[PDB]
């Protein structure tokens, strides 16, 4: 999270850290007791490693009462996702068991109505990703309020040049942005999850490259099928 500030500890109970060999790899969102939503490209260069989901965390290094590291029972990427495309960049992780819920661990409701978040709407994005251009990752959870950018502005040649589909959404990126390590993380508009970060190899905090988020509402039937 670039140009943001530290999140109040445990104020986002749905926040998860998708880990590879005990190191933060991607953001994640607890959507059901045993299921975490993240991005498919997160698992791309893992193959050998121990994939785990850390819940009720604020600090990645420091012990906290609520912090519990969970093993992964099942990894369900979207069936149509693959390595060469930003399309369908969603991943459903099944925890070793149902999550121990409490004040710091609780699932988040996701947008079911397939209609765009109005341009200008202020949304909240959190994650343990890079905070500057030097690649510095934070110890504690960071967040930033971002205005939703309309698809037409986002599709300009200066920006994403037509790459923004109806299943993707945009947010402003001028010196306040999602970055490397924030992928799989949540984009929340009015307490409801609207998008899952899909950063990739996009430069961050540059007004010329707006932030890209997968619209959860577009994948309503698929999430229900995996969770049922």
């Amino acid at each position: 999270i670039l140009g943001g500030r530290e999140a109040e500890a445990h104020a986002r109970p749905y926040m998860a850290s998708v880990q590879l060999n005990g190191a933060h790899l991607c953001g994640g969102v607890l959507v059901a007791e045993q299921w975490v939503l993240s991005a498919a490209h997160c698992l791309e260069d893992a193959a050998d490693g121990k994939v785990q989901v850390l819940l009720g965390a604020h600090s990645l290094s420091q012990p906290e009462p609520s912090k519990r590291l969970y093993d992964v029972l099942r990894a369900v990427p979207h069936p149509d996702s693959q390595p060469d495309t930003i399309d369908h960049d969603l991943l459903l992780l099944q925890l070793s068991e149902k999550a121990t819920l409490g004040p710091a661990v609780r699932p988040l409701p996701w947008q079911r109505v397939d209609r765009d978040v109005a341009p200008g709407t202020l949304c909240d994005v959190a994650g343990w990703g890079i905070v500057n251009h030097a690649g510095r990752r934070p110890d504690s959870l960071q967040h930033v309020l971002l205005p939703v950018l309309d698809r037409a502005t986002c599709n300009r040649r200066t920006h994403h040049d037509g790459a923004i589909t109806e299943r993707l959404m945009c947010a402003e990126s001028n010196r306040r942005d999602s970055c490397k390590g924030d992928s799989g993380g949540p984009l929340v508009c009015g307490g409801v999850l609207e998008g899952v970060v899909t950063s990739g190899s996009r430069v961050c905090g540059n007004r010329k490259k707006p932030g890209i988020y997968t619209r959860v509402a577009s994948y309503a039937a698929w999430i229900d099928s995996v969770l049922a």
Partner: antibody
Amino acid sequence: EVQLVQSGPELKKPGASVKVSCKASGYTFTNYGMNWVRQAPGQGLEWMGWINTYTGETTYADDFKGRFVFSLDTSVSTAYLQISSLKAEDTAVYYCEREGGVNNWGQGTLVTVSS
Amino acid sequence: DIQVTQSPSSLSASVGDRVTITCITSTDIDDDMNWYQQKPGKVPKLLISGGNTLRPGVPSRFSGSGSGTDFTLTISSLQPEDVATYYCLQSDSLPYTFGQGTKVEIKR
């Protein structure tokens, strides 16, 4: 496939106004904005401005502020250019260019301003 | 509004020659330079987009270079069909801005 089809040539008297249409097909009209370009006879291309097809917001190049208005009709996926208080110097080919993706242009519209 | 200065106004070269056209912006624009080709009675054709990206169905003899302020369009081996007016367009921010154009003729 993507198509941008503009209305036919028009002759207008000085002081009158003109409305040029740019009918878009083969893509989601609101996913891409529309640019307007003018080419006076034997002159260079002039970027007039843009219209955001999702929000209706407009940005005009300095030379084009005032007498030039971009508008939309989302129901028919059409972008419009309205030029008021026409003068001899407005005699030009007016193009619409879809902003972003595989680059697409309308065929142009010759507007002649004469008595 | 960002200003662009295209050069030269016109040139003449033989088949096989190398054509060099330049555009200088009033500010640092990064990679956001475009090049268009316009044949006599035809609509403009985008040849090169930002980052000096060649467009589909554009011959490889066309190439772009430069960053920030100083941009160049190169036609490595001038062909008869290349006779046209060439325009650069800066797309850093709105409003976008065209160069004055360069008319390219063939010396035969």
